[PDB]
Paper text:
Peptidyl-prolyl isomerases (PPIases) catalyze cis/trans isomerization of peptidyl-prolyl bonds, which is often rate-limiting for protein folding. SlyD is a two-domain enzyme containing both a PPIase FK506-binding protein (FKBP) domain and an insert-in-flap (IF) chaperone domain. In order to improve our understanding of the mechanism of SlyD and of FKBPs in general, we set out to analyze the kinetics, energetics, and structural basis for substrate binding and inhibition of SlyD from Thermus thermophilus (TtSlyD) using 15-residue-long unmodified peptides, which we reasoned would be better mimics of natural unfolded protein substrates than the traditionally used 4-nitroanilide tetrapeptides. In total, we obtained five structures of TtSlyDFL and three of TtSlyDΔIF at a maximum resolution of up to 1.4 Å.
To study the length dependency, we used variants of the S2 peptide extended or truncated with up to eight residues. Extension of the peptide had minor to moderate effects on the affinity for the IF domain (up to threefold higher) and the FKBP domain (up to threefold lower). A peptide is bound to the IF domain in four structures: TtSlyDFL:S2, TtSlyDFL:S2-W23A, TtSlyDFL:S2-plus, and TtSlyDFL:T1. The binding site consists of a highly hydrophobic groove comprising V74, F79, F91, L103, V115, and F117, as well as the edge of the β8–β9 hairpin. Interestingly, although the binding mode is variable, three aspects are shared for all structures: (i) the peptides bind to the β8–β9 hairpin through β-strand augmentation with two to four hydrogen bonds, (ii) the peptides generally insert two hydrophobic side chains into the binding groove as detailed above, and (iii) peptide binding does not perturb the hydrophobic groove.
Residue numbers in the entry:
A (entry chain A): 1 to 150
B (entry chain B): 30 to 41
The structure:
């Protein structure tokens, strides 16, 4: 059976970004319901059960481009005093209205900290090695929920 | 944000 709309597909995968492995594992998903990033589902569309392949997914079809407006300067005094504020450090944050805005520290210059509110994979292309383990039809309940059962 | 980040973010 081929991967297509409304099929429940099991894959094994490895994810690399710029030659470094970030994740690997096995999962099942209902295809065609935005359950995985769009470029990965595009790469899976039409594959036969058993097929192994490579997929280079551009940033636009993964976590999106890097928005320059996500890079902002905040005061050092805003950070918790017991924290290490150094390049690469990640922190949970919110705006004044309580909207989540997690950040990564880019640089510290005196009492000014440059941070980045973009997702860490924004602007990055993703490289996948994938094996299609199994393809089957969805149950009516899976179709109703739009997700493969756990 | 343009000029407002320095006043408008709480960090936890
Ligand atoms: Cl995904
Ligand atoms: Cl800075
Ligand atoms: Na799914």
């Amino acid at each position: 059976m081929k991967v297509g709309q409304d099929k429940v597909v099991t894959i094994r995968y490895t994810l690399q970004v710029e030659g470094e492995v970030l994740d690997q594992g096995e999962l099942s998903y209902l295809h065609g319901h935005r359950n995985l990033i769009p470029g990965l589902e595009e790469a899976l569309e039409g594959r036969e059960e058993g097929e192994a392949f490579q997929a280079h997914v551009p940033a636009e079809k993964a976590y999106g481009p890097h928005d320059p407006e996500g890079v902002q300067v905040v005061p050092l005094s805003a950070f918790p005093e017991d924290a290490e504020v150094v390049p690469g450090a990640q922190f949970y944050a919110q705006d004044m209205e309580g909207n989540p805005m997690p950040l990564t520290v880019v640089a510290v210059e005196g009492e000014e900290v440059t941070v980045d509110f973009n997702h860490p994979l924004a602007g990055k292309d993703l490289d996948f090695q994938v094996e299609v383990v199994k393809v089957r039809e969805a149950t009516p309940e899976e179709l109703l929920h739009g997700h493969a059962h756990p | 944000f343009i000029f407002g980040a320095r006043n408008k973010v709480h960090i936890y």
